[PDB]
A paper describes a structure:
Following this pattern, the type 1 pilus usher (FimD) and chaperone (FimC) help type 1 pili assemble into a composite pilus structure consisting of a short tip fibrillum made up of the adhesin protein (FimH) and two minor subunits (FimG and FimF) that is joined to the pilus rod, a homopolymer of ~1000 FimA subunits. Once extruded to the extracellular surface, the type 1 pilus coils into a rigid right-handed helical structure that is capable of unwinding into a flexible linear fiber. This ability to transition between a coiled, helical rod and a linear fiber has been proposed to allow the type 1 pilus to act as a ‘molecular spring’ to maintain adherence in the face of fluid shear forces.
To characterize FimA polymers that form the type 1 pilus rod, we solved the cryo-EM structure of native type 1 pili appearing in a preparation of recombinantly expressed Type IV pili (T4P) from the [name] K12 strain BW25113. The FimA reconstruction had an overall resolution of 4.2 Å, which is sufficient to build an atomic model of the structure. Overall, the type 1 pilus is a 70 Å diameter rod where each adjacent subunit rotates around the helical axis by 115° and translates along the axis by 7.7 Å. Further, in the structure we observe the N-terminal donor strand of one subunit completing the β-sheet of the adjacent subunit. We can explain this by the fact that Ala22 in our rod model is tightly packed against Ala93 from another subunit and Val37 from a third subunit. Pili formed with the WT FimABW25113 protein require more than twice the force to unwind than the pili formed by the FimA BW25113 variant with an A22R mutation (~30 pN vs. 11pN), likely due to steric clashes caused by this substitution affecting the tightly packed interface between subunits. Interestingly, the non-conserved residues within the FimA sequences are all located on the exterior surface of the solved cryo-EM model, which is likely indicative of immune pressures selecting for antigenic diversification.
Author numbering:
A (entry chain I), B (entry chain K), C (entry chain E), D (entry chain C), E (entry chain A), F (entry chain B), ...: 3 to 158
């Protein structure tokens, strides 16, 4: 007495390099929280800040004992190259505001897909490259939904 | 020697009001536990009860030294307005049963998104508004999976 | 060295009213699950039930601090006005069965496009109006594929 | 005991260049959402904004380690060269409004099929070039259906 | 106050056999993607490969607990009987290239309308017979549009 | 250096009434699927059923806040006035079978061009009037091609 | 045992120039929709607007990296040179109305067969030149059938 | 109050054999497209190629489970027996060029009315025998209109 | 430098009544298809059946909100008054066979020019009165060419 | 064993000028349709209007890059020089009515054989000069058959 | 003041058997991760491995106290019957590699839709059948995107 179920959908990658990503760690999701224009209403204001993490597994330091990352993603302005713009349904989200990411070095990384981060040190096996998320305003902000996306390119 | 990773997805909000939510505290998840119809099989039975928590951070009492919450969510019946109904895949979950939430005041709150809770007192900075979860039956219950959802609206 | 790609297709609406829909939330898709005639074979049986959600964004309560919804869609019978009939390729799907939706009030809503739901309370900004999906049989059911569709009209 | 079925229709391209498009990513569809003239009724208003994505696969950086895109599509006006006009059945859609796309650089791209975007950096293999969609009004807008189309030309 | 609309056109089949096709699943359309001669320029090269699906519904295993498929369609050569040739407007599409389909068994099926596939196992109700599409070159290929068609005959 | 192309052919209507049809929605085409006489071989059998949709755009409720539809088209018999007969090349299609359409009310509508449907409720702007297609046999059916046509008259 | 069938009729062109047309794309047909005099009853009114597309294939930019189009077709008036008049059986169609086409530039093109459009940019291979169709009234319009035709001349 | 209309003209055939043709499928018309001498200017050049289809309906495999086709039509030369010549008004069409048809086997079929094609396999009911149209030059071609005709004889 | 062309020949009618015919719709031509004596060899056999259409335009319901049609044409026999006989060159066509037309009511209409059809309902403007063509044998048929003609008289 | 057939009759022209006519396009026949005195009963009434086409082939723009047409034919009155009178068997056709032709410019052309039309632009090869036919009454019209003829003179 | 929203689309099944699937658990998606050819470049190599889960709900052991699963899906080779092949856009994904699934028994299951798994033990209510995903190479692998699909058939 057999029956039908449905469909399964596996994902992943195959990439020939030093480390290997737990792509859930990249596809990891964050809830930065609920934020106010009471503080984040200035051309330069940084709200308080929240952590982010990366996971690598089973890594050979001989191919590359080091690593870094570049990001891309829709930035706001040519004078705010390290800021990420938001992506939610139209007429909903906020304005005069973006998102900033901080390296291990506390560094505002550019969204170009070239601006590689600091050369992380890699052990054998497993590592972690934590970044710290926050908002970096671009003037008096709108009370709006906040939702974003950025692509995770890596250097070894 | 660069490589691809994948996608990142940040979340949050921007809301101009007194306090600011750690939206993980709202998106906080509970495992109430495994429960029996041995006790929860009556039009009025309350199973034993479990705690729930809220987190606010960096709050100015001058905008609002107080706060409260209304909830909404699929209730069961018009005579059981303070009960929450369950949301799991069909043919699986239980019946003749719902969920109750209790305020700081031990109060059965309504699921309408208007029925604001007790006016919490707010300090400067950080606060906590714990609620207590439990089941509130609506007759002899089914042995079924229990899974729910409710939206978290706030007053300041 | 340029090349061809292909076509892009954007969608949306422009509607002058209080709130604004994340039309992905309406075009949101559900997988209620796999269900049995072991329970859903009666003129009145309700299978266990699953949740559904709505999203509004950047809403002014002054235009309308409230809101509701009517639905339409192919119902089955004039004596089952709150039931939705199924829409899959012919000779495949089930029979003597439909679908029910439940309001926040646990209410069997009619498929007419007029039967507005309960007057939701609207904050400023962003809200959620969860409904709960389930099957509502119309006698002993066929083992058949289950697939449906309903249109999402709104009141403010 | 054989029977008839029907017709199948495969699609694709063959193009000799650096990367190769997942033409579903171009033929990718967006639901920007439902939008209001409450905000989008000005010669310059930008509604809140939503994300868009591109996919390339199995790319050799030696042919071209870089890439960009030009778009074409029916724009509205010669003074609004970066705006896209809407394409739905006549007498239905809105007016005094169009659509804007934003580069990774937050750039209003022209609809000519020549105005190549920023030179994306390409790794080996797989990349992503996210754009951000929104409306850019051209005065007080009509409440109308919103539906669009734009062609996706690429530079390597 | 009545008005004119226009014409409707329904389609389908009536076939007396074990299963019944969701002829949208056959008339299902694929966008394999954009492909390069950088890899697909050899008498035998297989580009990377994409999936395809079939849908049957409400099937009796007693008439036939099994099933298979033959295809026909314009192949290229008598020495490439399992390859499908392309069908787009003249002077546009590519050359020295075709299309291959793969069975559940990873099998290059012939385009004759007789070469029945592997005997799929059929449950009661609903099934799926996924195939995998790709290109199978016949020498150094032209950069050209790629567009195809194949007829879907079935065995029970 | 100019050249010849060919001919273009636009279509449409101009009708002075409440709503306006996206006549593609009427000229919309359906593939109901492949169907069996295993179930559809009775004077009254209804095969499983598939959905159909209508689109109106930019509608004023003041001219008419309501609407309905009558259909015409070659029916089979005077005792089967709500059934549609099939229209394919002769000696090909099936027999002892027709097609049924179901209103929003699940109603077998007559093919006369007068039998107006239920009075749909019309909002401002855009609406949808989904119908559900299926076969309604007239005895033991032939295995034959199934192809139909019906005209779409409207009431406001 | 042979039999008769009938006649086949192929079509096309042979033209020595840069690109080559998919003459189905020119002979492409549109259903603009059903339209009202409620809006289109003014000497200058533009109904909402619908898209149109062109297809070129296997194009050499060295012969001509650019291209444009002129149209001809029965216009209405010498003061409405960019308007197309309608062509349906007599006493049927509407009056005090025509049709407008819009370039990629949103430009009212003349029906002369000389007024070449904007110089499109041509890649190698395949391109698309979308136009946008709509009605451009010439006073209070008749409720009448709408049907048109225009010839597609090209510049390289 | 009766009136005159006009004349109707039905067509068809009556032929006693295995299958039965949808003679619209034979009388089916193709628009191969617009083609260039840039590629089609050689004694042997094949332009890129487009598909063609056939339709049979309600076929008994017992009379003949197989089928094929011969063609006739004005060919060009005794050394180009598989080429079709063009038929348009004099002084208009092209020269040093013809048309080729390809079988399911990718076979240049002769225009004699005897050269039967590959023995297609016939199911019960309905089948399809797709051919692929293209040009096969006979030297440097004229830029001329392209228009053709060929008769469709069948084997069972 | 003028030249000669040739002759033009316009046609039509002028008739004072409710609706007005698109006399192309009457002079519309059908290709019913190729048919077999395998089924159509009985005193009463009806081959499978194909559709036919009528077009009226710009109609006033006040002169006549209704309409119908009578036909005439060479019938076969006084006992087969609803059958149409065939008209092709002598010694060619078939025998023991005719043609049947079916009303919207599925009605065998008489060829007399008096037997008015069902009273169609007429809207304002444009309507359609589809009929369905098929063969109605008069015994074992000849394999012969099939070609017919019938005159289209109308009632308002 | 030879037999007799009959007579063949070819036609055409030989004219030394820029373009060459597909004299079927001139000898092309139109069925304007059935028309009413309900609208066409005024000294100036124009019924709704239908299209007409011309075909030229293999044209050299160097002899003449331009072209136009004059018409002649039996007009009605010296005050209605642009109207064409009707030519059917006597006592049959209508009266107080004629026919009008419209240029590409929407121009009432004179029937003299001198009044050359607008200077069409000619490409190389093939062109089209569409005109639009309609009736232009000369008072209250008779219900009568409508049939006409006009000669097609050309300028280069 | 009502407005339009959009469309909803529910899904599911109705199947008469012991347990009932949370078809989200089948339609559950996995991100296995990013993988290297540094280890997965051998005819037999198994990369490290990741978990997968199933969900059943409200199950009666009396109909069936046991259960198992067969899978189907495009495998690679007849000598690698337990391997799943990948399905992403062409020219993108990897090669000389597939995917393996492991039963509760650590068993390489076949993709046939018949090879039922181990007989799971079923309690009353709710169960879980975890599988473990990994790659099983077929030689030295390509660095390519990895994406798959497999159908979930069940035994009770």
């Amino acid at each position: 007495t057999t029956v039908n179920g449905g469909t399964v959908h596996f994902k992943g990658e195959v990439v020939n390099a030093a480390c290997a990503v737990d792509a859930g760690s990249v596809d990891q999701t964050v809830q930065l929280g609920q934020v106010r224009t009471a503080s984040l209403a200035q051309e330069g204001a940084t709200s308080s800040a929240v952590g982010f993490n990366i996971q690598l597994n089973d890594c050979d330091t001989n191919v590359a004992s080091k690593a870094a990352v570049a990001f891309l993603g829709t930035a706001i302005d040519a004078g705010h190259t390290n800021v990420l713009a938001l992506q939610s349904s139209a007429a909903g989200s906020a304005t005069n505001v973006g998102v900033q990411i901080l390296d291990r070095t506390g560094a505002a990384l550019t969204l170009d897909g070239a601006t590689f981060s600091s050369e992380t040190t890699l052990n054998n096996g497993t590592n972690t490259i934590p970044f710290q998320a926050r908002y970096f305003a671009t003037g008096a902000a709108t009370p709006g939904a906040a939702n974003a996306d950025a692509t995770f390119k890596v250097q070894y």
